[PDB]
């Protein structure tokens, strides 16, 4: 995954052959492990973008992208 | 239940195709893979592939891609084995095989096996044996037991049937598998007896060769000088 | 590919003894922990049965004598006590493709020398411009033996076919033909043959030899 | 995940923790390579269970299940 950023905060494009895989990236504050758990498609036109919640020994409710380290935002196509 | 159920044994000429079934029993069929092992006279076990009767997909041996071709026929639950441009070495048993199982596993396993089929490529035709009564040495052997042997060359197909005296003389017997000798199969036996036996009492070779429907008696007689 | 190596070609064992055999992959037919290598008797009449699947799971029916392991490459047969139902090719299998090992024969005694007699040409064959000379040589243990043919001296080696029997239900021995074939036109031209046993029962070997015109 | 099988054709039961890894397992035609790209949750009552197509050298479409050698179903559910 393509890693940027949005308003400061960390940004993750990911691609396809990324489904079901941690995704990991470093950050001044150690490594951060993001979980994707999405409709996770092929990179195309059709992109949703949203929030990857801070969870810290909470289990995840009503989501499917989280990291434990610090929040990241996540944006994939979902076309196929 | 879980059988497999073979053809019978064929008699094909060189160049020509053979195209041996399989029939299975006691389990899906569609569930299997079936496999199709080889064996040469005095050689190991050698694979032939292994259909797969739901999709049709099937890998051979390198060995045998092009002269080999596996099918099946799921409403017979019937797999069939054809072999093209045949030659003397294509001679051997071939095997059906379950592979047990179902892991998406290697097993590799063969845990149900046919009959087996055997083929045999054969140019030569039918030819009766001759036979050879084999006589000691010109003035006999020392010792107290005498060795008498029984040559049978040049025959086509196996088998023959040799015996001694019709069948009474059947102890100190060894009658050696047949071998080859230009496209014709050659055979011996010797029999061994005290010496107050021979030559005193006759000793008989008696050699029977169904294909060409023959039955030939060759008395063993001492040998004189030239 | 994968080449099954197995090791030794035949094993000779007595009753009571511990037979092992060994199978030498190339490629470690090993995956996801599992090892995908498989025992396989075989009686002559009969087609293989499977004794040891995934390298140690002794099939349905087999008797705990068998027992197999390995990992890798490198996989072993064990007999434990050997019984006369042994008696059998063994071979090895891989299941990641279908090869199989060059199977192991496995055989069932005191050291017997061979009783050798040889036998001129009969005169019917005579008769057909073709000669054989055949040597028996019978009831020997063990199996190792090699013949020598000479024909006034000089050794031959084109022509000569020799048989086996199968190791004799009751008394444990082989025996052999040994057949040295040549024209009668060349078998008329020599005197003297002899065929030669190389065995382990004699330092040198026996030696049957006629001379063609004698009596 | 185990390893069974549908009518002679290899079946996957996928777990949870399986999500976002390649999927591989031996088969007498060499080692077989499924990509699972599924809403993939805790196997339960609620499982879906369908088939992984083989394909060569060809783009995936209309699919989050797709295998290199030999066809494969697979079956896992949905709760979370």
């Known amino acids: 995954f393509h890693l940027t950023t949005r308003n400061g905060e960390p940004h993750m494009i990911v691609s396809r052959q990324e489904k079901g895989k941690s995704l990991l990236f470093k950050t001044e504050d150690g490594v951060n492990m993001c979980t994707l758990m999405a409709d996770l498609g092929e990179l195309c036109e059709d992109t949703i973008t949203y929030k990857c919640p801070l969870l810290r020994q909470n289990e995840p409710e009503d989501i499917d992208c989280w990291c434990n380290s610090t929040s990241t935002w996540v944006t994939y196509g979902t076309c196929t | 239940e879980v059988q497999l159920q073979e053809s019978g044994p064929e008699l094909v000429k060189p160049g020509t195709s053979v195209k041996m079934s399989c029939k299975a029993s006691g389990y899906t069929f569609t569930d299997y893979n079936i496999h199709w092992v080889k064996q040469s006279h005095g050689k190991s076990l050698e694979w032939i592939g292994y259909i797969n009767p739901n999709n049709g997909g099937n890998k051979y041996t390198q060995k045998f891609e092009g002269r080999a071709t596996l099918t099946v026929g799921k409403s017979s639950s019937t797999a069939y084995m054809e072999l093209r441009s045949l030659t003397s070495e294509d001679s051997a048993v071939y095997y059906c095989?379950?592979?047990?199982?179902?892991?998406?596993?290697?097993?590799?396993?063969?845990?149900?096996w046919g009959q087996g089929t055997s083929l045999s490529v054969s140019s030569a035709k039918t030819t009766a044996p001759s036979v050879y009564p084999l006589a000691p040495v010109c003035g006999g052997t020392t010792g107290s037991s005498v060795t008498l042997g029984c040559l049978v060359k040049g025959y086509f197909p196996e088998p023959v049937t040799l015996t001694w005296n019709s069948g009474s003389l059947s102890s100190g017997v060894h009658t050696f598998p047949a071998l080859l000798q230009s496209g014709l199969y050659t055979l011996s036996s010797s029999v061994t007896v005290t010496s107050n036996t021979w030559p005193s009492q006759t000793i008989t070779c008696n050699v029977a060769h169904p294909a060409s429907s023959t039955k030939v008696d060759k008395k063993i007689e001492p040998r004189v000088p030239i | 590919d994968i080449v099954l190596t197995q090791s030794p070609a035949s094993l000779a064992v007595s009753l009571g003894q511990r037979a092992t055999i060994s199978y030498r992959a190339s490629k470690s037919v090993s995956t996801s922990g599992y090892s995908y290598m498989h025992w396989n008797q075989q009686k002559p009449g009969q087609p293989p049965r499977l004794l040891i699947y995934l390298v140690s799971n002794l099939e349905s029916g087999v008797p705990a004598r068998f027992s197999g392991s390995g990992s890798g490459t490198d996989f072993t047969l064990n007999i434990h006590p050997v019984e006369e139902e042994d008696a059998a090719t063994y071979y090895c299998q891989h299941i990641r493709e279908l090869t199989f090992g060059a199977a192991p024969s496995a055989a069932a005694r005191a050291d017997a020398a061979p009783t050798v007699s040889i036998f001129p040409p009969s005169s019917e064959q005579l008769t057909s411009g073709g000669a054989s000379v055949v040597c028996f040589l019978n009831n020997f243990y063990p199996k190792d033996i090699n013949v020598k043919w000479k024909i006034d001296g000089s050794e031959r080696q084109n022509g000569v076919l020799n048989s086996w029997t199968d190791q004799d239900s009751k008394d444990s021995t082989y025996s052999m033909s040994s057949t040295l074939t040549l024209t009668k036109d060349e078998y008329e031209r020599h005197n003297s043959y002899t065929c030669e046993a190389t065995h382990k029962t004699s330092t040198s070997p026996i030696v049957k030899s006629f001379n063609r015109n004698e009596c | 995940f185990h390893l069974t099988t549908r009518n002679g054709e290899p079946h996957m039961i996928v777990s949870r923790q399986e999500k976002g890894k390649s999927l591989l397992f031996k088969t007498e035609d060499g080692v077989n390579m499924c990509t699972l790209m599924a809403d993939l949750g805790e196997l339960c009552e609620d499982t879906i269970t369908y088939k992984c197509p083989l394909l060569r050298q060809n783009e995936p479409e209309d699919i989050d299940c797709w295998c290199n050698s030999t066809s494969t179903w697979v079956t896992y559910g949905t709760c979370t």
């Open positions: 095989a379950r592979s047990p199982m179902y892991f998406y596993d290697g097993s590799y396993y063969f845990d149900y």
